Ligand binder design. Sequence first.
Ligand SMILES: NC(=O)c1ccc[n+]([C@@H]2O[C@H](COP(=O)([O-])OP(=O)(O)OC[C@H]3O[C@@H](n4cnc5c(N)ncnc54)[C@H](O)[C@@H]3O)[C@@H](O)[C@H]2O)c1
Ligand SMILES: NC(=O)c1ccc[n+]([C@@H]2O[C@H](COP(=O)([O-])OP(=O)(O)OC[C@H]3O[C@@H](n4cnc5c(N)ncnc54)[C@H](O)[C@@H]3O)[C@@H](O)[C@H]2O)c1
Ligand SMILES: NC(=O)c1ccc[n+]([C@@H]2O[C@H](COP(=O)([O-])OP(=O)(O)OC[C@H]3O[C@@H](n4cnc5c(N)ncnc54)[C@H](O)[C@@H]3O)[C@@H](O)[C@H]2O)c1
Ligand SMILES: NC(=O)c1ccc[n+]([C@@H]2O[C@H](COP(=O)([O-])OP(=O)(O)OC[C@H]3O[C@@H](n4cnc5c(N)ncnc54)[C@H](O)[C@@H]3O)[C@@H](O)[C@H]2O)c1
Ligand SMILES: NC(=O)c1ccc[n+]([C@@H]2O[C@H](COP(=O)([O-])OP(=O)(O)OC[C@H]3O[C@@H](n4cnc5c(N)ncnc54)[C@H](O)[C@@H]3O)[C@@H](O)[C@H]2O)c1
Lengths: 337, 337, 368, 340, 368
Amino acid sequence: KLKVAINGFGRIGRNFLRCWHGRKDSPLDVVVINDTGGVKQASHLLKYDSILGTFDADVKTAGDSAISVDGKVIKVVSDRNPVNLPWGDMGIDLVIEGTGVFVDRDGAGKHLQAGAKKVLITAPGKGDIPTYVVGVNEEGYTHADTIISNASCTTNCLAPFVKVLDQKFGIIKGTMTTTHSYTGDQRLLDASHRDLRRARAACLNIVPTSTGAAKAVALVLPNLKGKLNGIALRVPTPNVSVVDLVVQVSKKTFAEEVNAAFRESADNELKGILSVCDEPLVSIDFRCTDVSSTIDSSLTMVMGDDMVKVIAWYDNEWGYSQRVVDLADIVANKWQX
Amino acid sequence: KLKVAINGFGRIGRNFLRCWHGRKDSPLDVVVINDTGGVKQASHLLKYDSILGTFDADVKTAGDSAISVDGKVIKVVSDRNPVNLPWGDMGIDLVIEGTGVFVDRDGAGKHLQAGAKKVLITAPGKGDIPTYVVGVNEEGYTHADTIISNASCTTNCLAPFVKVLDQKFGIIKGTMTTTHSYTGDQRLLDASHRDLRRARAACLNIVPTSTGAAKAVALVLPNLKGKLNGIALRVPTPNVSVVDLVVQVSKKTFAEEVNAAFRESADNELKGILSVCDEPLVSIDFRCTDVSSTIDSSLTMVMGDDMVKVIAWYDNEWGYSQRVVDLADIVANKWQX
Amino acid sequence: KLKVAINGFGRIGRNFLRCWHGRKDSPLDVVVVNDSGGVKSATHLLKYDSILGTFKADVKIIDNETFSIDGKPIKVVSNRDPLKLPWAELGIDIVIEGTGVFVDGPGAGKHIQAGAKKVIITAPAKGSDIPTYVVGVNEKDYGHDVANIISNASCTTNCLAPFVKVLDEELGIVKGTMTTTHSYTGDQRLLDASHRDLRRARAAALNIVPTSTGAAKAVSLVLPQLKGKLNGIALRVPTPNVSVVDLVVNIEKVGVTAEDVNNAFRKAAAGPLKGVLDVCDIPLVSVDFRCSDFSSTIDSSLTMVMGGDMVKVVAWYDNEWGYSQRVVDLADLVANKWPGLEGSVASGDPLEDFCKDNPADEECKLYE
Amino acid sequence: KLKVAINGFGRIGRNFLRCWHGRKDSPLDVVVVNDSGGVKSATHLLKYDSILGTFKADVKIIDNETFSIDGKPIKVVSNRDPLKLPWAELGIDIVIEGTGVFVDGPGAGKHIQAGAKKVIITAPAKGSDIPTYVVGVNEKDYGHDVANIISNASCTTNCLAPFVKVLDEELGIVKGTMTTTHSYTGDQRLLDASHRDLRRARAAALNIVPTSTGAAKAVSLVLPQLKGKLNGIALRVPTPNVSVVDLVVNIEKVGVTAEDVNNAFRKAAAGPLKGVLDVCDIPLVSVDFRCSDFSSTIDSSLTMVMGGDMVKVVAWYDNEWGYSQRVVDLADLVANKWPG
Amino acid sequence: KLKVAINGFGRIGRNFLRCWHGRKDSPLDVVVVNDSGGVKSATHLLKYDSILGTFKADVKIIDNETFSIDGKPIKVVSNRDPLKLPWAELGIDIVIEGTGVFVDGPGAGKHIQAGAKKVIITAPAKGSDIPTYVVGVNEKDYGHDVANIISNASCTTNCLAPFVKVLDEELGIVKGTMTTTHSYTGDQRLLDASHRDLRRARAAALNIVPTSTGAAKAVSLVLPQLKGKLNGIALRVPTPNVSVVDLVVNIEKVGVTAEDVNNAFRKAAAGPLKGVLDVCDIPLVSVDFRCSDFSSTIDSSLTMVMGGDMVKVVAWYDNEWGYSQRVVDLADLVANKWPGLEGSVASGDPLEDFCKDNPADEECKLYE
Ligand SMILES: NC(=O)c1ccc[n+]([C@@H]2O[C@H](COP(=O)([O-])OP(=O)(O)OC[C@H]3O[C@@H](n4cnc5c(N)ncnc54)[C@H](O)[C@@H]3O)[C@@H](O)[C@H]2O)c1
Ligand SMILES: NC(=O)c1ccc[n+]([C@@H]2O[C@H](COP(=O)([O-])OP(=O)(O)OC[C@H]3O[C@@H](n4cnc5c(N)ncnc54)[C@H](O)[C@@H]3O)[C@@H](O)[C@H]2O)c1
Ligand SMILES: NC(=O)c1ccc[n+]([C@@H]2O[C@H](COP(=O)([O-])OP(=O)(O)OC[C@H]3O[C@@H](n4cnc5c(N)ncnc54)[C@H](O)[C@@H]3O)[C@@H](O)[C@H]2O)c1
Ligand SMILES: NC(=O)c1ccc[n+]([C@@H]2O[C@H](COP(=O)([O-])OP(=O)(O)OC[C@H]3O[C@@H](n4cnc5c(N)ncnc54)[C@H](O)[C@@H]3O)[C@@H](O)[C@H]2O)c1
Ligand SMILES: NC(=O)c1ccc[n+]([C@@H]2O[C@H](COP(=O)([O-])OP(=O)(O)OC[C@H]3O[C@@H](n4cnc5c(N)ncnc54)[C@H](O)[C@@H]3O)[C@@H](O)[C@H]2O)c1
């Protein structure tokens, strides 16, 4: 029922649609997308992705724009102006901006100006947008807000289980950081960019950065503001990333106490959202996890009873858009506006 | 003059010889190596390496064992028993064990038993071996010790500038960790291994581990014992790695104070050993740095005036063996035994 | 039922593992692993692969040397030499050589006299005493007691033999040159191996290593006529498990528009060479061809023709999943004709089977 | 002397700059760049490259739009359209189209209009008056002032063209199929949803991308005797700067074994086209063919001739830095031919 | 030193024995016998031929499971299966399958894993896994340990391979139906008898039992040009020990007369095919070709060609002294082609040396 197009049906857009189709409980009226790229090519590259090989269903471009995936017709147009994208072309309930360029309140308002009603920015709240990580404040997100934003896969990862860390224990300080996947957000080669670090080939090139993680951890989590703040690491992986953070918990914990708090919260406030794991492994078996973050509780070691070197895999791409489908449901379900 | 063979002329062995030949001040009588692999192939694969393209110098295989890369005859034999390797075959001053299998005091003593006099283990002190990182206690290493070990590229990196951090400032606690390069120390594919994490393909597979970093930081540095201790990250890079550590300095520092201490120590106790750098970049321009660690002082950020998220590139492979050539000189030079 | 103490819990070991137990209806019922890697690793590479990731099915670790893929009770024997391995200690009829050590004829025989009956090596072996079979051409050379130490054609040739069949049977190479991309397998190391050939003593997945491979010249076992109709080389490539063969060949029919080529390639692809021979046309990258049951996926769009005679034929082969499929197919056909095909005969003939034991009996003496 | 502005600080642009600096004869006076990134961009892509790594020399950062390099004061015009850099205001004798997107007639025609007098283009130009003059064969077919805007087709061509001439002169090509292990090209993107990009709209890298590049028959124009005699696929490898073209024919000769074929190569690869063709015979892979200033690095250790007419030549090339060496060969030769 | 736990002491067993012992430059110093012959009689039979009569050397009776030809201590084991044989229990290296039962390639391997290294079936092997050798053509196909399980060819084929090397190369077959007349062996029936065969079940040593032989296409193992150019019949003549072949086949090259045929045959006989290929011309009889070291003493006068194409070459030969002399040289050729392996000793192939042992060496891994 939730009239929803994805502005910029790119790999984040493809990934969100893959999540939604794999997802059930779908009042998401995914009957429209947006992709100024090849919309037929949008159908094809949604039909094929390394995270799932091909698509995790049969796509079927009902038309140049309409894509009847498993018969579920889904429009996708080649549009750029947010006041023009397929938002009021079919009265969009909730906007999804997968392009990254209209992450701002301005772009989202323009999405609405096309004739939409609500917006969900893929990035966290671009300054003047209420960021809503799945795990902390998307519960507190009554859908009355029109322009919202599921916090970044970085924050989608961190905010729920780091709220476990800073609430179940409380934390004096922590240099929060995410070993995020290098993405299309960088330069494929050592090409020009506004971030001379993201300017390199970025494939096997490290990116210590500051995505919506540093701001969103403060915004969604008043507990984790400033003292629990830091940078990001858009590291050279193309797959499920990890969080990297050594907090100094206020109430002194130990390794297994951290793991137990994360587990019980993965039973109350992180289940499906998160997943505690305790195996020496790598994303090649954490790939395509629906969770915001696969908590690697095994090596969240705690020296001094406060230094919690937290390890937690997190589906920076797939489970990110899985939680984005969760927030899109929290829009569709509990449709407050 | 320093009769020296490299047990296991592998990529660490090739790298050490590349360093030494690129290095000057060479009382290292590098006139012998050891490689049970193809010794002609040893000459070839020393003649060609991504870190330097081909070899820095150049030659065929001076027959086979002997090898003079437009520099000096160097033996290399196909031997496995340390009591048999070319150690007393030509009276080796200092043993270098590049294999990794005879890192122990037992293997080093057996190297001597072949007829050598001193040993330098490529790994840190394998338990009962005095580890000597270049930067902390290799200065304190009077060469009288026979079986020594230059601490791992991890520790070769960390110990000098982390002693700067814990002495120029003093540190209550720090979860020391190194984003070390994945190496041949792992499984090329998802194959058997005693570390089911180092069992995956390991190419783009993360390895949170504990190399000689965790033990050697305590051993070489009494200041940095336990409270300044943690794990390692044999991360999926094949090039110059980075250190990852958020200390809680005793005397509260700030970011630029950390950078200044690291710079002045790179003027007194880290020059050549280390290198302060302040550019958003990646190993593709930190590759083949002679230093133990290229200090990325720009992002060693300090929140709470104690949380120093230190960033420091470090030539895990090339500059590692560069500092190993330094310790081999400290053996050759100041030859105390 | 057909049991394998899989020689080595290798990547082909777990290939045919995640495709034999995956073959919910495999006559091959593995009950034991022949590997010195422990059940922990047996899972963490089987239950946790790289291609298929975590096994999409339980591997219940029964113990350190025993486990049960979804309850399928499969041991692990931390033992290497085949003679002392439980093909007799557990009556294990079948062996698949997932090691690369006992690839020789009598070396895989050590499986037999350790209690196996036959062996299939998932690689070319050290002679004609290992007459490789391929799903599509000469797999039906087989019965029980027929060529106990045999093999499956290499990645490239597991792809090739069925579709080089569909080619040279109707299209027909005058003389060809095969070039294929090949995953960075045990031929090399992640670092610069001190390996026998400096070409692939090079690191495995660092540079494209032109691995001149004559597996395409093993056609004598499966398609000997393609000798002088072929010249194969692999390309050691940095990609875990997906690949593609290509073959530009002057054809006897000379001008052979890749269209008619692909037409017959569908015809026998939709003919005898289903599941091993695909003929694809969508412009796609390896992930699309990744995990393709078809060993050959003739990329028709990338099939062009150079000199009329020179049709270029290009089949993507997810080489180790192409294995995981073809090992199942071949081993199951054999399984049907394995001692699973053991029966009796008539008096004049069943007693001749007793002669098969009693060679010099009555009048059983004939032939030199 | 040859005034140098690069239309966008290209990978070919930075590679060419590092070549020129490593070149000696080069009259290429680096004076401008059309780098729409800024001096920090042109620096940390030149000063920080990967193929030649950190730059061997100092890119002296004078003002963003006019820096220097070892005392080579180089302007920047952080601007796009070939007209947008005023190649007259900067007097740029030879444009270096770093972008390779204005490969058309009017594309680098705008280079000339803003005041260039000749142009060189880093791709099989889509313009006729833009001869993809290749090193090895038709850089000589470039009489000076003849179609001022000469392109230089991709290093796939800069490899093939010379030694495909060598093949047709020493072994003779009837119909030579090619499949260059060229890099994952820039007409891709790192990930899927690249652009229109019919097939390469997939990820540039995460799989082999066998796509027939125009370079396949961009060797045809440069080799007027190679008409149709190369139908090639650029298997855009997931490897940034290296490649090996390979040729298989039903050869004009009987197909003497690849031994004397590569011997004639060796004589050509050391004579006619040394620094251009390399008869690689040591078993080596992309690392040494990385930074290969050779137009061609014939891995003669692997070249084969099976059925006689079946031939095979395995000619590596660094396809950006070695390609930049090709472009410097073009620029140097043109500069020698220049009216001044 | 190339001892053989002679896998069956019998007619060809003692033939080879009388030949290799009679031979001086024979490394095939058998020092153990695999046969239910019983020294007492093992000697006797070895001591007593009919072709050679009483053996032309002493065979002294050491002890029940041991004897000594003139004082050549050679053990005797009345074993049958190759695994349970002193190939390791006496460190034996070459196997000669005089049994005529272990033609099976892994069944021959049973010798090697009983501690032997190479087997030779003194008759057609179990199939095309086994490139057979008879002296004059392709013993070199064997390199040290290369095709350890092999066979020496049979009367027709033991004859064939050398003179078909001379024939199909200078003469050149097109097609045809070989005709050989061969003695009754221990693989026949003197009287009529039943159990498996009918032809050789019938009285083979009484009538000319018309016996075919597909070993004419056993040339598939050695000379591929003859494939599809032959199919033979082994006329089971009731003579004790002599056979003769004739290659009644159409010839491509100008279908010349047997004269030139025999001329080039004399040439290559005196050329690479002496001791094995003989081409005589005197009007002669079987005894003149008995005790013939050569597996082919062609009678040039009795060779004729009438159809031009259909050549006739009467390659006569003591069918087992030809054999026994051949297995001597054959196994001798291998006996020399044994260890050898000049020490490169560069420590460079020491990697390769231990890599032939440990393929996945510390750094030499190949083939997953
Ligand atoms: N990458 C992560 O792990 C993660 C982390 C933080 C934020 N995000 C979110 O993911 C996105 C990352 O950017 P991305 O480029 O990878 O997204 P993406 O993968 O979905 O690709 C975006 C595509 O949309 C197309 N496009 C651009 N403008 C358009 C327009 N206005 N109309 C229709 N189509 C248009 C572009 O061609 C581009 O290929 C951002 O939106 C950000 O909010 C993701
Ligand atoms: N990898 C790093 O960044 C770093 C960090 C910590 C320690 N190290 C040191 O580097 C080495 C890493 O191991 P590696 O395998 O990469 O070393 P390496 O790259 O030098 O290769 C070792 C080679 O030696 C050969 N070899 C094995 N045993 C031999 C024998 N006894 N005689 C002669 N040759 C033999 C093997 O074939 C192997 O290829 C260890 O020795 C360790 O001490 C390096
Ligand atoms: N993985 C594939 O599907 C594939 C790909 C390429 C090649 N191959 C061929 O298949 C064979 C095995 O392939 P793989 O995938 O298993 O490679 P792999 O590297 O994964 O297998 C090596 C395995 O063999 C085992 N092993 C080694 N020596 C042994 C011995 N003495 N006894 C018992 N086990 C032993 C080891 O435990 C290890 O698990 C190789 O010979 C290779 O040529 C298979
Ligand atoms: N780079 C090479 O060695 C070479 C080899 C093959 C193909 N190409 C061609 O070069 C083009 C670029 O791809 P690449 O990866 O090779 O990089 P490249 O080095 O050839 O050029 C990339 C540069 O072009 C610049 N650019 C693009 N459009 C521009 C314009 N509007 N104005 C100013 N600068 C512009 C960008 O700033 C970028 O820095 C492709 O179309 C490709 O066909 C070049
Ligand atoms: N003798 C020949 O030249 C001739 C030629 C070709 C093949 N053969 C094969 O040899 C067999 C006997 O023929 P032959 O009479 O000429 O004698 P022979 O010399 O070929 O061998 C006969 C000997 O083999 C022994 N033998 C049989 N089975 C055995 C076993 N399983 N283990 C150990 N020894 C065994 C017998 O004791 C007998 O003494 C036939 O079955 C035939 O297939 C014989």
